[PDB]
Amino acid sequence: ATHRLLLLGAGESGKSTIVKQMRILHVGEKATKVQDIKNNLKEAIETIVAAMSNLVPPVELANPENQFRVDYILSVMNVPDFDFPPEFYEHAKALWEDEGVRACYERSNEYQLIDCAQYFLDKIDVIKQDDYVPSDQDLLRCRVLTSGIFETKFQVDKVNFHMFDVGGQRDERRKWIQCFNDVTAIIFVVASSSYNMVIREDNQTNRLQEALNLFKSIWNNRWLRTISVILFLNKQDLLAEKVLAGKSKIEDYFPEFARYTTPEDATPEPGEDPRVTRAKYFIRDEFLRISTASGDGRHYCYPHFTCAVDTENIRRVFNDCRDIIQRMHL
């Protein structure tokens, strides 16, 4: 039997990261992906420095010396084919070391900054080696936007899976429709953590709210009245951290969180902070209200608290899915 799974979700929600996990789990090339990793590293640093002067209030370096490195990073910012000379890494790390720069990083929600920033910046010395080999984790972090539709094929216990990946950004959504017929199930991806961020498309639409409205669009779609949705509440790790950091409150972006108390059937993780539990579930329910209101038992919604970059958490919930595919005779 073959089950064609479609991956839908906003931008950077983590769609490509799951398809990656599928090759990790059920399926010399790493050479070409080193470049893309470095490209990430570059964007990460150059973006944070850029934001320093534009944030309000602006952000001052803790070491005036670094200004020159700041001037450096900017000068090579739009360079076409960058050589990634040895100095670059030095100037890069230097800045990262700079406390003021990190202060700016903490306010990265106030500007568009790729996820893998901190991760990669923290291994400049590793990535700079010319004998450098990307770990599976690094590849999981390597962010590269997807434009168009990509189909991946795998097999699990001789059960065939045809997974479809697409672009999450608004301009891409117009290609989705080409996979709405004969689809088996929809795996809707959500970037739980991005409750304090806005999308790139206008830098004004809240990212979480964008996911909601988008989910609503798929749920209540005139051609998905029967299709059940496997809702992945991803980037749990980022969410938890954010919640525990206490810096930016959820009730400030979604005031309805103030009225919220945690559910009964709530099953927390071993030693999971009640605030984290209370939050991730608040988030989940927001998506359930959307599915509950309509559908008429024609199709169903299956939540999942996930972390795509985590091959273990993913091997876990994916099985939770293989079941529902079989168990529901889908």
């Binding site: 709405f180 998905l224 009245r225 029967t226």
Partner: protein
């Protein structure tokens, strides 16, 4: 259940022939609106004959444009020569009803070979049609064609076993699409 049953079906290895009237407006600036519709009907009546002979399938008629396709209903390896011959017979066909018109009526044959997706769209007033890039391209041969000749693509020449004789149509310079798509056109001699 989700989408209306689509009465569509793919079809590989076929030949798509388009044909329009060289300067139809000049033609209409002379004869009565009725006489045109009659000359038209007259022609295509003769056309539909040649079609069923040349193993073709008339698809639809849009004023002065006639487009049938060999390779249907049933697949035929001879699908290319059919359209060609069809073009041939069409060439003379139009030439003979030019006698009745007493005016410069002429055609412009364009044929590209490939694959289509045919059926019918919507729910009401069904009309058989064909759909594909090759089908768009065939249409552009008819456009970037040459009056009185047969404008075949390099694909239509490869299913032809070159039993016919071609020559640079240079259609790339006679039509934007053919140029923008690096298309080597020819013309049956």
């Amino acid at each position: 259940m989700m989408f209306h049953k689509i009465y569509i079906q793919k079809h590989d290895n076929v030949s798509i022939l388009f044909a329009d009237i060289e300067g139809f407006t000049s033609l209409a600036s002379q004869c009565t609106a009725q006489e045109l519709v009659m000359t038209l009907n007259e022609l295509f009546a003769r056309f539909d004959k040649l079609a069923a002979e040349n193993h073709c399938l008339r698809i639809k008629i849009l004023g002065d444009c006639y487009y049938c396709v060999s390779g249907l209903p049933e697949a035929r390896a001879d699908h290319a020569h059919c359209c060609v011959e069809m073009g041939m017979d069409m060439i003379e066909a139009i030439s003979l009803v030019r006698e009745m018109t007493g005016v410069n009526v002429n055609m412009r044959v364009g044929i590209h070979s490939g694959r289509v997706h045919c059926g019918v769209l919507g729910l009401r007033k069904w009309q058989f049609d064909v759909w594909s890039n090759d089908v768009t391209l065939a249409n552009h041969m008819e456009a970037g064609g040459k009056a009185g000749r047969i404008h075949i693509t390099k694909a239509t020449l490869s299913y032809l076993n070159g039993d016919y004789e071609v020559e640079p149509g240079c259609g790339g310079e006679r039509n934007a699409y053919l140029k923008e798509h690096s298309i080597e056109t020819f013309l049956i001699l």
